[PDB]
Each structure stands twice: as C-alpha cells, then as structure tokens.
C-alpha cells in the first residue's frame, strides 16, 4: 500500500536508542570536551572572528592638492620662487603625486657631436679604444669612434648626442627645495562597497570648513584632518626628510577602512599608516632613490631646436586605500553552526574509546552498547 | 588475533538502533522541519546565492580616446579652435581622463615684486600689518614686509613671486568650453580572469566596424555601444553638464563584469553605471569642484623666462571596472551539502525535546529510548 | 530535585545503541565508501588545495626605468638623437609606461582657415555639398561652408583649424624608431600582504649590484633578473616588435606572487608573463594599435601662438602584479574536518538502503534495527 507507507513515512517518529552509562569520570570529561568546542565555536569563530558575516573590498577615487612657497637664490640658476606649478610634475597623477626636492640643469642643448664626460671607461688615448657605434654605458649618446679633446688636461670619446652632455654626479647637497619638508598635502578620499551600497568620504560630517582651513593631521590630537605635512609624514616613517631629499625616495599614505557595517554609518573610519616603498641597499639595489629625466624643448632664432635636460630628484607620495567591510549574512552562519554540530560528535568518540578501551568493565559496556545480528 | 580483529572490522556493518513513535503532530513536525532546512539548502545557497561556485576578481586595461572640435570668440583670448590635442590635459592617462571645460589664464608672468591681489587680508596701511617672510594663505609668494600700492586706490602688500600673480575670484560663467557637452568617448575595456584563464574585450563580437562608426550608447536601445557622450554621460548620473562645467568635477563610468562561467562565454556582458565622485557641501568640504594648475613656459629674447600659469577647471572622467566570475567547484558543494546533513539533526533534537518534556507519555518515551547501564 | 538533576546529566554518559551485522559484502562497500570520502577530504582538500590556509590579496608598488639611445637621419626631421627623455611621452607614469616607435608631425601649425585634406567626404564642387558648422569625421576643425582649392587638381570644403591640417594617411614604414626593439626595461616592484604583515621586493637578496649591471632576463638562465629587453619581450608574447611597432600596441608585463607563507620567505619569488592587451581585427574594432595626440606650444616674434602636433605611434607596457599568499588557519581545517564527519554518514545511509532494501533478509535486519513503540 503506497499510501499506508507514505503515512507511515509521515506519521511516525524515529529516533535513536541510547545507552546511559554512570560514570564520573567520563560524564565529565564529555561535558569538559564539549565545553572547549562550544568555546571554541562562539568565541573564537562568532565573537571574535565575527564568522557570521561576509564581505567586501572597497573601491576608492583618490585627489591630492599641495600647497606652499619655496624660495631659492643660488648662483647657477639665480633667485627663483617655487609654487605648486613648479615643483610638481606633472600636475596631476592618478593615486600618487611627486614633489621635486633636488635637480640637475642642463641647459641651452644641441644635436651635435661632443666628448662625453671624463670617466675611466670614456677617457681614450690616440683615438684607438674608442669602437664606434657603442651606445656605453651613459646610453645618452653613439659613440662616433674619435678621440676629442674634453679640456687641456684629458681626453675623452666622442659621442653624438645632445650636447653639452649630463654631468650627473656631483648630486647638490644638502636638497635644492629642502623647504618643501613644510609644506603641507591634502587627500581626499571617497569610497565605495558596491556589495552593500555604502559609499563614504574621508572628510567627516563632523569635520566643518572652518577646521580644515588650520588643521594639520596629528594622530593623537587630530586623527581625521587630512591635510598632511611632508616633512611629518616622511617623520612619522621612521625615517628624515632632509635625508631623503638629496636623493628622492617613495612614501606610501595608507588608508585603512575596515569597518562593521552591522553597527552605525558613523563609525566607518579612516587610518592613516606610512611606510616607505623604496630600500636602501647599496649592496643588492640599482637605480637607489627615485628621479626621473624630463626635457623643455625650444627654438633658437635661426629655427633650430634647443632643449633643458632636467634631472628631478624627489619624493612620490602613493595613496593606498585598503580595506574590508563587513555585514551579518545567514550562510556563513548556518555553515559555522552545522561545523560545530559535527564537531560536537568528536566528544562521543573519544568517550567511546575510552569506555570501551581503557577500562575493567570494558566488556561489559560493548555487551551493552553493541547488539549481533547472527 | 590480530587478524581476526581486522576481518571482523571489514566484515561487519553497525548501525545504530532507532525507536519508532506512532505520533501525528510530532511526525508532522519534524517533516516540516526537515522539508524547511532543505528548501533552505537547496534554494538560497544553491539555486539562489550559487553555493557549489568558486570565485575570481577580474583584471581589466583601460583605453581611453576623445572626439569632439569647440570654437570660442572671447575677448581676452580671441577666436581659437580646440581640437583633442588641447582641452586633454594631458594627452593619455591611465584609467581615467581630464577634459578642461573652464579656464583662468595669467600670460607673460616673470619672477620678481608685485602687490597682492587686493582683499581683507592683503589689504595693508602704513607698512606695519606686512610680515617678512610669510607666505600668506595663497601660497604663490613669500611677502617681503613693504607696502606697495596695486592702483590708485587700494594699497596692499609686497610679495616676491610670478609675476602679475593669478586672480582667480571670478570664475567664467557660462563655462569656456560649454561644447564639450557635445564630444564623444569611446572606452575599450579588455579583462582578464587569471584563475579560470577567460579573457574579454568590452566590443562584443556581434558589434561590427560599420556600427562603431556612428552609435551612441544608450541602455535601452544601444546597451553595448561603447562610445558615450559627455553631455550624457553626466546626465544619466542625475546631474546637468552646464553647472558642474563651470567649477569641474568628477565622473566615474562604472563597468561591471558579473557573469558566471558555467554559461556560454557570450553571455558575460558588460553593465555600464555612471556615479559623481565628489561631493557638493558648503558646509563640510575644502577645495570644491575640481581643478589644478599647469604651467607653460618661454623664454623672452633677452634670455629671461616667462610662463603662462593656467588653472583649468574641467571633469575628470575615471573609468571603474569591477566583478567576478563563477564556475562550479566541488569544495564549496561538498561543505555545503555536509553543513545541510548536519543541520538535518536539529529537527531530531527538537522532536526529541517535545516528547520527552511536553507529552502525558513522556515517560514513557523516556523510558523507551534511554537504557541505563546500572 | 534541580542538583539531583544537575547531577546525572554530568555524571552520566549517554552513547548510541549499535546493531552489528556480519555481511561480507555490505561491510566492504561501507569501509570502501569511507576510505573514499576520507581520501578526498584529506588528498584534494587539505594535501591538494589547501583547505588549511586563509588568503590574503597583495599590494603592490611599481617603479619603472628606460636605457637605450636611438639615431636617426631622414629628410623631413633630420639627422637626431633619441634618448630617453625623448621616446618616453610622459617621462613618468603608474604601473605603465609607453615608449614612442613611430610618429607623424605637422609643424608651425596656426589658427585660420584651411582645406581639408583631399578625400571622397570632403572633396566639394562648386561650394554647394559643403555645410557650415559641421564638425565632421576628422573632428579636426568646424567646416565655414566655402569651397576652396587645396591645390592646382582638387578643391575640397574650407575649416578653421590649426593649419595646416594633419594628413595622417600614410603611417611610416618600417617604424621610426625601429631601434626601441634593443632597448631594456628594469622593473622594481615591492609587494605588501597587510593580514600577514610581509613585505618583499622582486629583486631578491641573492642578486647582487654587479649581476644587475649587464643581466637580462631569461626565463631558463636568468629567470630573477628584472631587467627586460623590449623587443624579446613582445617575442616572448608569441608577436614580432618590427610589425608591431608601425601602428602601436599594449603589452603586459605579469608578475605573479604566489606563495605559501607556511614555508621560509625565501620561497616567496615571483613568475614573469608576457600578454598582449591590444586586438588585431579589421571587422570589429576601432581605433586599432595604439597611438595619441599631443602637442607642442611656440611663440612666433610677432607674439602668436604657433604649435607642432604630434600623433605618436608606439608600444604601451602595462605592469599587473597580482597574486594570493596562504597562511594556516584554524578555522577552514575545523570547518573542513566537520564537513568531512558530516558526510561520513552517507556511507551508513546507502548501507542502510541496500541491507534494508536489497536483501532477502531485509525484514531480520528491519525487525532488529528498528523497536516500534506502540
Ligand atoms: C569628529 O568625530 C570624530 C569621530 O570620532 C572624532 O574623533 C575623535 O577624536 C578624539 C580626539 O580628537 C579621539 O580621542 C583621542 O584619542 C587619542 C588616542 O587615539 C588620545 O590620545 C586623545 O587624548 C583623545 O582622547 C577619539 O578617539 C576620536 N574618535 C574615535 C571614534 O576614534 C572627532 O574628535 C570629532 N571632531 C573633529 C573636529 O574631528
Ligand atoms: C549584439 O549582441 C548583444 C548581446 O545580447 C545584443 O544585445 C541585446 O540588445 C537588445 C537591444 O539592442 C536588448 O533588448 C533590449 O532590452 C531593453 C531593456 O534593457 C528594451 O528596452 C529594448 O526594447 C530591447 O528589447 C537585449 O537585452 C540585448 N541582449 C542582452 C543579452 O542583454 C545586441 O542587440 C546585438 N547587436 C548589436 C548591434 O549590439
Ligand atoms: C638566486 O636565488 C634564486 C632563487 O632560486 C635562484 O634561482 C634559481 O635559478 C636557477 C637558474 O638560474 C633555476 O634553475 C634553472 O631552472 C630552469 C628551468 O626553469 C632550467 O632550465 C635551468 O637549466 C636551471 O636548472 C632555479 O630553478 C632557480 N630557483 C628557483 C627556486 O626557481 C638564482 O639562481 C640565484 N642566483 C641568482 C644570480 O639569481
Ligand atoms: C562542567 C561543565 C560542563 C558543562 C556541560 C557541557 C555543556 C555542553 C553540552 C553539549 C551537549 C551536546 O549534546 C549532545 O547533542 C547531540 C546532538 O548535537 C546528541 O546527539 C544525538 O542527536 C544527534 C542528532 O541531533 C544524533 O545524530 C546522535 O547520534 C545522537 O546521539 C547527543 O546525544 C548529546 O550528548
Ligand atoms: C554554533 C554551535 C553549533 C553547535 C550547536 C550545538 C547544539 C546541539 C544541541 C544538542 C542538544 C542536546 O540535547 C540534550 O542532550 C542531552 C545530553 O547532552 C540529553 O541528555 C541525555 O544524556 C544525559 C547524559 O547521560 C542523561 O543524563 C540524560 O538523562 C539524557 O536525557 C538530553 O535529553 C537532550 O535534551
Ligand atoms: C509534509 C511533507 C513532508 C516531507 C517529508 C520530509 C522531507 C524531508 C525528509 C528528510 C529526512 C532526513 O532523514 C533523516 O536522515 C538522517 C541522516 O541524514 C537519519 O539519521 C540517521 O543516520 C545518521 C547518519 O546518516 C546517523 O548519524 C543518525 O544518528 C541516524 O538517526 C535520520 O534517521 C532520518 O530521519
Ligand atoms: C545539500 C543537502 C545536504 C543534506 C542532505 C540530506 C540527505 C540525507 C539523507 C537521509 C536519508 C534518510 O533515509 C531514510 O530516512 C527515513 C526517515 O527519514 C527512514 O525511515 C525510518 O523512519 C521513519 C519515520 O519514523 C519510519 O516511518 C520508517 O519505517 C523508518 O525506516 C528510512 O529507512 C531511510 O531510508
Ligand atoms: C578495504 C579498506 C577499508 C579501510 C577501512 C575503512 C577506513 C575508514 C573507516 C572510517 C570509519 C568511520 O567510523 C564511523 O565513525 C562515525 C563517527 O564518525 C561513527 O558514528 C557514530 O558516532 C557518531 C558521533 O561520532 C554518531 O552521531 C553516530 O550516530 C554513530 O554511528 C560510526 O559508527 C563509525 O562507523
Ligand atoms: C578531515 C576528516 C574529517 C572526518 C574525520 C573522521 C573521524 C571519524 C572518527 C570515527 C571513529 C570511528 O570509531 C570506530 O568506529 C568503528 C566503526 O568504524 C567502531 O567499530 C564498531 O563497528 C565495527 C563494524 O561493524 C565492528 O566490527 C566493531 O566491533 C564495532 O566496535 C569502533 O568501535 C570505533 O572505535
Ligand atoms: C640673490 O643673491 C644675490 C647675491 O648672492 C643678490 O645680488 C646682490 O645683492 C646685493 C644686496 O642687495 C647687492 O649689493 C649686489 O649688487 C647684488 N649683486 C651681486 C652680484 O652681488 C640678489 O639681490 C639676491 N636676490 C634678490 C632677489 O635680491
Ligand atoms: C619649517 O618651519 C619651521 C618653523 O615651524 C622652521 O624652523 C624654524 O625656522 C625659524 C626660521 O625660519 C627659526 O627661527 C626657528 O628656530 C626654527 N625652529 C623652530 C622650532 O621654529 C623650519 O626651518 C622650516 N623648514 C624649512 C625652512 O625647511
Ligand atoms: C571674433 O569676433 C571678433 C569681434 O568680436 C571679429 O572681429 C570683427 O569682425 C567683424 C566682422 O567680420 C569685422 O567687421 C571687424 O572689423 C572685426 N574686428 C573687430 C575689432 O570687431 C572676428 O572676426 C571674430 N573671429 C573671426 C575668426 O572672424
Ligand atoms: C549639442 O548639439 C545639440 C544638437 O543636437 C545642440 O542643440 C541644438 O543646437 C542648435 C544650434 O546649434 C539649435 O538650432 C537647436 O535648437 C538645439 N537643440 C536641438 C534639440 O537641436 C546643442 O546646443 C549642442 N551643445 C552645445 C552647443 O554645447
Ligand atoms: C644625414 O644624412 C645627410 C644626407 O642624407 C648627410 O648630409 C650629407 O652628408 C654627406 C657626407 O658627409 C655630404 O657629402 C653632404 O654634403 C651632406 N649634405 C647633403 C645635402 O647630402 C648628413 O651628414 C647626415 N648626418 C650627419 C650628422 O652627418
Ligand atoms: C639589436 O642588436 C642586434 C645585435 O645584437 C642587431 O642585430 C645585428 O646588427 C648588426 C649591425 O648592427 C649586424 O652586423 C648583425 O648581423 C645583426 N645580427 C646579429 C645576430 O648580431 C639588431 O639589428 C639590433 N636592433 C635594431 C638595430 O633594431
Ligand atoms: N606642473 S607641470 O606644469 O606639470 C610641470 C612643471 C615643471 N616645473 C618646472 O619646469 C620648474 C623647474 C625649473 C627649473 C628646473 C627644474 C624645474 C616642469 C614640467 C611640468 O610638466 C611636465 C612637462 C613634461 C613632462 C612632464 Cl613629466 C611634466
Ligand atoms: N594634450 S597635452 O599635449 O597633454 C597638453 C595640452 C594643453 N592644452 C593647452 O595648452 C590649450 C590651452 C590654451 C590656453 C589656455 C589653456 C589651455 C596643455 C598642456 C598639455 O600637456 C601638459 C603639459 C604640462 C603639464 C601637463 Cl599636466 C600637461
Ligand atoms: N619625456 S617628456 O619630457 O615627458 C616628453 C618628451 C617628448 N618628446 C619629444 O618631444 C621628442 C619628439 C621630437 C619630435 C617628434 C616627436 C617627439 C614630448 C613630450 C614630453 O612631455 C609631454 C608634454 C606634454 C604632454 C605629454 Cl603627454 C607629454
Ligand atoms: C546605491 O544606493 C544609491 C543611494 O545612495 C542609489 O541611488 C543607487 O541606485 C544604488 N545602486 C544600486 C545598484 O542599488
Ligand atoms: C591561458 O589561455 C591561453 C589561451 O587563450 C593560453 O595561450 C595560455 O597559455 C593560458 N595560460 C595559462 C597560464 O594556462
Ligand atoms: C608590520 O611589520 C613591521 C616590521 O617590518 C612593523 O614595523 C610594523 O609595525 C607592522 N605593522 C603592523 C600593523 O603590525
């Protein structure tokens, strides 16, 4: 009868025979067993590790704005003022920004053919080291094969290149715009969890226009102003500005948003960490420091073209925006709640070992508890 | 016998014994219940949220090209042309794209002494309220503490900067490029998923040459055209191009690639969203719009250097690609399907429960299912 | 009695009732049936895929640098020196850098009025098909309507532009700067796991400052050093640099980390992939190869303003550095070693169906299983 099984199926209740065994020591150690992975299951996975959430990365859009005035007067290139026109190339980048802090000119350049700079590999004698067509080791110029007099006192290769060549090794010290340790970067970061359709800015309500016109970011007095201070920054580090200026170098800004969206809106905030992105290692490092050459590119009356060889030493300062936010959601849940009933049967494992293992009436218990079909 | 004790472990089956109770509602209960936990398994983390499924971030490469000519007959500037190759600065960027749409322009700037632009601040008497030295809140000079008239009416103090400095306090209106409304975009997005080895490109194999050359992308009628108006595209945002034109903004063409593998690779398409990533509050916000400063420089005939110092303002359009992939795996089903055997004993547990505290037999259930072991 | 029942429920040990049933077959199909789950569980979870472990996304910082000079002598432009602040348009980018291979110039270009170049569109007679103010395909100037002569054979539709106009209809062949193809290209790249606090660089301890002077990468000799040359990079993606460089293209350079922190940090190296980003089809794309627009702004004597317009052909390097590290987690084992208990009773169930369902002794072995309680 399919209908008699199906109410059968339906209408009755099975569940499983147990066998209650008195014993101290082992109700005890069950219960101390489950206890631990019950422990176990809420702390560490619900409480603490807040296993009953999923989650989400964060899509930031990041705009940077410099502000301050250095002033210079040296004798090669004269008094000179440095805005945020000058001293940041270029304009505008994308989640990074460059500040000039040191340079080398070399102006008024032509096509031509001149010696290279004096060097144990360029210096030549009687015109016969010298191979043409070897671009060297410089890359700045092909060699053309001639010895040529650099000055009265030595010889050196000729090349042709741009000309007069890039004497890049007398590096100016201290920095040419050490004043730039004072001034002062401005982030602004707005952010975005396209799981959960949370969308946040770095400024905070709280933070008014009044306060943003004198703050400057201190992380025990002023934790959410994010107008920076260079010099701060690269302190803040671990490391010195006036230093790290000669050569250049790379800085990270580091913004943490790692909030619970479980809780209110007003509690997703920013962190600021820094953290230098370049190593000093004279031993395993090439290209140290950071610079990088650009050109200004003229015309002489005669309609010829000239160019200005800069090569910019300075600081890149990389925005990192990282994070992850977190909501209550049912299926890790259920998983971490049925991972624990399973666990929970590791208990009557070792209990039954112990039982019918490790003790005198062992044979009586699996009397007891094992039933033979013959 | 060590053998005989294997034989018997490999040739013997044990299952457990089960009591069966002839009880309607406590059957129909724990049917309920189980048939509840299993439409649960099945439906939200299978059918629904995709439970037997592995995931991967998608790795994307932008490219980015702009059309469009505008014409302007100002005063100050005169009849001039504006092709891509001047309203892009600069010319290519990554994931992202500046098309100036206001300017201000202060041409034929030298180095040396010149008064403020008049205002409370700058506004100065008798030489006493100027301090050497301070660069002052416009950052573009460092005063020099002498008093000096700017007209014949109004008197303010000395700094030594670019000289005449910028006055940017009256913003164009109507914006100087009001034509950009009318320029196109075109966006090509190539993605790539490392784990799965599946890679895309955002013009879809249907989309041939004849059509690229004259669509415009529309959700309705042209979802897959890649070539977006600006005018548009700040539209269907919620906002109006006109206003957010005249002090500049920010737009974020949003692609999104969601498509699950275990499908034909012609299904996974691209969703495009446009959002505003800045924020209009005048009460909680610093440098507003979106603008910055470039500068170009010449040289004048007697050898000095000039510069021009442009502020453009302008919207920067950032193009956001996020999404995963997935395809079926067999971890994530395994978990699922153990997790869903374990919570089928919840329903025992509870009919467990209600018979052996909540029936005028509850004893002798209770007697029934526990044996004790005296 | 509440401590009475306090009591027993920790002193007593509550364990299954079993019923064993010697049956050679269905005891080897149940240890079979385990041995199999087991096997999976342990091999392809934990040993395989790595069940054990929680995974972190790595944050990267990239730095790229150019050598190598060019020489070139052609009658349009002349005998000239390519150096690196020359083909490298912008001397810097983020994770990307694009090196020019071919151009095309128009010199001493100004705002006027000028024909179009010659074509089957803006061919005209007798100023009748022209339509003022009609941008056209070219977006190149604003037509005025008034047909005029190019030259002593053909007349085409007026615009006002810069003029004259560029004729980019004839791209050079070979490439201009054909030599880029023995250029080489350090990549620097540190990497930062924030969950796991680790940090590393891709050039490795063991590689030392003089092996860097003169390596390039090999991925049988010199898998580590992190200098590339270009043209045996585009070889390396199963492409050719000659053909590649007429009209441009994208390359990826792709690192990968991917390692196991549960080992020494030794072993934390990463892979180097070549990919190309750009399409080859003549039926279904736009804008093929790669190339921009971008100019140059004089000073004629008279104070205009002149321009030369360069559309720049060349090969755009991408850096994508991706990967995940693993580190040892409590969690995933636990959730793994439950969902394994979990599915150990399949074994039980399909050996409950067979012994109660496909024998002929499947009513014994119902009648001792199962104790109805009437
Ligand atoms: C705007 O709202 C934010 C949101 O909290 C306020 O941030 C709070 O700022 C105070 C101090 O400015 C923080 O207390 C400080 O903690 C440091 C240790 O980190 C301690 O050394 C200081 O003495 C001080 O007690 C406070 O923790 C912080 N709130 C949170 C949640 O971190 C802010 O003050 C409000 N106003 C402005 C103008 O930003
Ligand atoms: C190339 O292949 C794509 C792949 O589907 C085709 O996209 C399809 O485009 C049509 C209309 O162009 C879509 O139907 C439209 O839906 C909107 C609602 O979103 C409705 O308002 C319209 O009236 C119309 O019914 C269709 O959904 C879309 N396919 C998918 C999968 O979304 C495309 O048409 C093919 N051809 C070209 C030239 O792109
Ligand atoms: C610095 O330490 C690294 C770390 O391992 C060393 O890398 C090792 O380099 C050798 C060859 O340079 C690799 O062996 C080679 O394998 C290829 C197949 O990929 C084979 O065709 C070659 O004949 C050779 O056997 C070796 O696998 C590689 N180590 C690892 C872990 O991959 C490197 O050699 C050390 N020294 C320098 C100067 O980099
Ligand atoms: C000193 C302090 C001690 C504190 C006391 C201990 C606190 C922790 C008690 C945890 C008790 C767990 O209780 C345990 O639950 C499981 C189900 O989960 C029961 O298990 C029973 O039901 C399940 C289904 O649900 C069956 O598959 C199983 O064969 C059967 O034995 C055990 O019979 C019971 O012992
Ligand atoms: C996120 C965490 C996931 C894991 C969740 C765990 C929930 C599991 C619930 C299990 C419920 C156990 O349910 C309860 O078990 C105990 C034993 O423990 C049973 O108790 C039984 O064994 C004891 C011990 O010998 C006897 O003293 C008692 O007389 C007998 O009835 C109860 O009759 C039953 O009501
Ligand atoms: C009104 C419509 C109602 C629709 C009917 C209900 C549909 C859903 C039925 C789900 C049935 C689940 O069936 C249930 O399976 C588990 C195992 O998973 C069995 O459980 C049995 O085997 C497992 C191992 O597999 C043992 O650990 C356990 O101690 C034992 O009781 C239960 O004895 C049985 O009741
Ligand atoms: C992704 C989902 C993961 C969860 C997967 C769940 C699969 C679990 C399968 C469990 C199989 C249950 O297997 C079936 O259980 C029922 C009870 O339900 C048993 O039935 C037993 O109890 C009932 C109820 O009192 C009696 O009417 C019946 O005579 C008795 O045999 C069957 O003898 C067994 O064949
Ligand atoms: C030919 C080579 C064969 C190799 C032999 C097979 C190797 C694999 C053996 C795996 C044995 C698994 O052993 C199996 O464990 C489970 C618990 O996990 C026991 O299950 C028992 O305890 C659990 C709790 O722990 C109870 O919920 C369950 O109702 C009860 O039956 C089974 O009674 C036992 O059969
Ligand atoms: C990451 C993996 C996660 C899964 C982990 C699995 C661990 C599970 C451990 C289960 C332990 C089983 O524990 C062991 O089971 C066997 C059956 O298998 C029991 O053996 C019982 O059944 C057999 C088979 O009929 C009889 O021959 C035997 O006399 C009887 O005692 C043992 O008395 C018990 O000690
Ligand atoms: C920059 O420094 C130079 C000298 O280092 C200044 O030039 C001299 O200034 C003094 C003081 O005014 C005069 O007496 C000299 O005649 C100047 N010339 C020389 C060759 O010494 C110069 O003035 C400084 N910059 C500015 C803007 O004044
Ligand atoms: C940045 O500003 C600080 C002042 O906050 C400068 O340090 C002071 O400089 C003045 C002269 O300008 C000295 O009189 C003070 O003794 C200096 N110290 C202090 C504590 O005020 C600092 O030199 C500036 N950074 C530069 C110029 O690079
Ligand atoms: C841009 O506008 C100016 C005036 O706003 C034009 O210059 C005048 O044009 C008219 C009409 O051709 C002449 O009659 C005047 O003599 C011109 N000069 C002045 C001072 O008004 C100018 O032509 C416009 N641009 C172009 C390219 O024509
Ligand atoms: C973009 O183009 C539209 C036309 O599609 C312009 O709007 C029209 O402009 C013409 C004159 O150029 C007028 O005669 C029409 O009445 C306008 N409206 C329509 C519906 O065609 C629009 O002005 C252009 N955007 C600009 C110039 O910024
Ligand atoms: C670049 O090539 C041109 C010719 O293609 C060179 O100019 C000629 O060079 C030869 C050999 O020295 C002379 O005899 C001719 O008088 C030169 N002029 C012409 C018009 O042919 C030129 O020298 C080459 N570049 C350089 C740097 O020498
Ligand atoms: C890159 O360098 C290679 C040499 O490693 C050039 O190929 C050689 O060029 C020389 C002349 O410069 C010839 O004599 C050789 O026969 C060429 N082949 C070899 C195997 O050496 C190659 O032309 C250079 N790439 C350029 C110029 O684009
Ligand atoms: N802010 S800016 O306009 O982008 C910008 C500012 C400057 N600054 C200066 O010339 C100041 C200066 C004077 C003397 C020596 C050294 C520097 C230079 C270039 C700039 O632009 C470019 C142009 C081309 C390539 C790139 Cl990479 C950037
Ligand atoms: N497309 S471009 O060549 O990159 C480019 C185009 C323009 N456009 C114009 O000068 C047109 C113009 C005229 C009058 C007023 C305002 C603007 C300006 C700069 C450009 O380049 C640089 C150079 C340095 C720094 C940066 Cl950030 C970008
Ligand atoms: N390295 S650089 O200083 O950035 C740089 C180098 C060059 N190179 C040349 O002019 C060499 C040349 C000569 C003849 C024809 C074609 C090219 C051009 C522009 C450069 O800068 C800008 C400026 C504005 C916008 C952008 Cl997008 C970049
Ligand atoms: C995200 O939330 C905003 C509300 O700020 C809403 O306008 C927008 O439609 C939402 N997007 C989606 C995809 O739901
Ligand atoms: C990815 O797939 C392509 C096929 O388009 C293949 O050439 C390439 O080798 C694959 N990469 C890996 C790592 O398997
Ligand atoms: C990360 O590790 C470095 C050690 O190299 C340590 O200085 C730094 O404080 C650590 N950061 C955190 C957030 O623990």
Redesign the pocket.
Known sequence: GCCAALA??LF???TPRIVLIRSRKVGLMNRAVQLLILAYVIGWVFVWEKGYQETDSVVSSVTTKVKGVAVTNTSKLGFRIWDVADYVIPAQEENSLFVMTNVILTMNQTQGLCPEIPDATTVCKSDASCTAGSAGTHSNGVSTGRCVAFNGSVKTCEVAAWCPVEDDTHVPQPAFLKAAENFTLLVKNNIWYPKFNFSKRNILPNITTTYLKSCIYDAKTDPFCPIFRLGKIVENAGHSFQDMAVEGGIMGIQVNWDCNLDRAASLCLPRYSFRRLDTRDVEHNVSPGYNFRFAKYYRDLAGNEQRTLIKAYGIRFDIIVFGKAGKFDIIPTMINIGSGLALLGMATVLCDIIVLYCMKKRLYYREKKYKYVE
Chains 1, 2, 3 share one sequence.
């Open positions: 059968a199926f009755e209740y099975d």
